[PDB]
């Protein structure tokens with residue numbers, strides 16, 4: 001019969017930082033205090049091979065806090081990225097080259113999640129169709145996040161990548177946002193919300209936060225709460241300065 005298989009290791013890998021006004025983590029706050037938020041990628045060691053979740057910020061952000069000057073989000077988003085935080089350099093320091101990866105999973109195509117996608121020209125890049133179409137046609141997305149000739153593996157809805165690695169369709173923060181539900185050998189069930197909730201309070205208290213469609217984001221939180229009720233996972237949020245204070249990071253794993 002079937003026996004649940006698990007991921008060997010889940011690593012949390014810091015991939016630079018990004019400043020956002022605090023009203024992006026709580027839409028009720030009056031703008032004027034920036035927060036220096038973590039940017040994450042995740043590396044999964046699986047029986048099938050290594051899987052990278054998200055790819056950090058684009059090269060244009062390197063030593064360029066002013067990347068969004070001149071744009072509709074000038075002053076609202078300030079990347080904090082050095083040369084060391086380029087995904088290929090991160091990967092090389094951990095022990096991989098792009099072609100070693102089995103899959104890339106793009107949670108969504110915001111610049112802090114897909115800015116490194118162009119480095120992976122052979123690995124299949126798993127992305128929701130509604131996210132891909134949004135980035136193709138909407139000028140809010142950076143071109144770096146929707147390069148045309150990458151090996152996209154477009155999916156629709158929930159999806160099993162390999163045994164132990166699940167994608168949960170969680171639109172709202174972006175049109176085709178997806179979260180991850182992972183079963184690891186050391187820890188059991190893990191929910192990576194990604195940006196379906198920037199912080200614990202966005203999830204527990206349903207505090208509104210930056211996103212394309214807040215009403216959808218709330219329904220995706222409600223779905224994730226159903227999952228949580230059934231699976232009781234450990235939960236990690238997308239851009240949570242408080243939670244970062246307790247998160248085990250590379251070279252530790254869960």
Ligand SMILES: CCCCCC(=O)N[C@@H](CCO)C(=O)O
Nearest residue numbers: 024076110111112140141142210
């Ligand atoms: C004002 C807070 C915005 C939060 C996330 C977002 O829309 N990111 C966009 C910004 C560029 O339009 C992206 O990364 O594509």
Ligand SMILES: [Zn+2]
Nearest residue numbers: 108110173195
């Ligand atoms: Zn986002």
Ligand SMILES: [Zn+2]
Nearest residue numbers: 110112195238
């Ligand atoms: Zn994000």
